[PDB]
Amino acid sequence: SHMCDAFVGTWKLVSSENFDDYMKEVGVGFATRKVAGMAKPNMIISVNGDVITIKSESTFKNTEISFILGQEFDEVTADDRKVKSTITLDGGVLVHVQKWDGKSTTIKRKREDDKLVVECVMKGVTSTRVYERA
Ligand SMILES: c1ccc(-c2c3c(nc([C@H]4CCCO4)c2-c2nnn[nH]2)CCCCC3)cc1
């Protein structure tokens, strides 16, 4: 067992707050905002050894990242940004920082009750998205 075990599973989006504004701050264009905002992704998290895999599956796009905590990787996001990412575990929270074009955003995934609570922050705008077990 590892602390990271509480994140493993299939998680379905059940609520979203402020995601459109967050996407505006990120620089996402109108059509992508509308279609991506409409999606109801599943977040599938698994662990094999030191490698964590996070998949997002939806009608819009399917994405998959695999990584080792603290080891930077190149990621293409669902909106087609080419970013350099690092994910660490800080006090039980998975903290994902993405850097591109002199910009940064942070995505924090936390287990709270039976939910996965995901907070995304860009330049003072936060979005909160809540996922429940599928
Ligand atoms: C369908 C819809 C949205 C996404 C997505 C996107 C972004 N950020 C996330 C953040 C939210 C919290 C977990 O990642 C998700 C996401 N939402 N759920 N899974 N992935 C970046 C902003 C532009 C739009 C793409 C992926 C597929």
Domain edges within the chain: 9-130
Is residue 131 a known part of a binding site? yes
Give CA–CA dist 66/131, Å, rounded.
Answer: 20
Domain 9-130, CATH: 2.40.128.20
Which of 14, 38, 56, 107 for mutating ligand 1's site (highest number of atoms within 8 Å of CB)?
Answer: 56
The burial class, CB within 10 Å (0-12 / 13-18 / 19+), for 103 is middle
Buried b / exposed e across 50-86, counting CB within 10 Å, b at 16+?
eebebbbbbebbebebebeeeeeeebebbbebebebb
* Resolution of this structure in Å: 1.0
For residue 58, give every residue at least 6 positions away whose Cβ sits within 8 Å of its Cβ, in sequence order, or none.
Answer: 39, 40, 41, 42
Considering only CA atoms, give the Rg of the chain.
Answer: 14
Single-letter residue type at 104: S
Q: Is the CB of 129 under 6 A from ligand 1?
A: yes
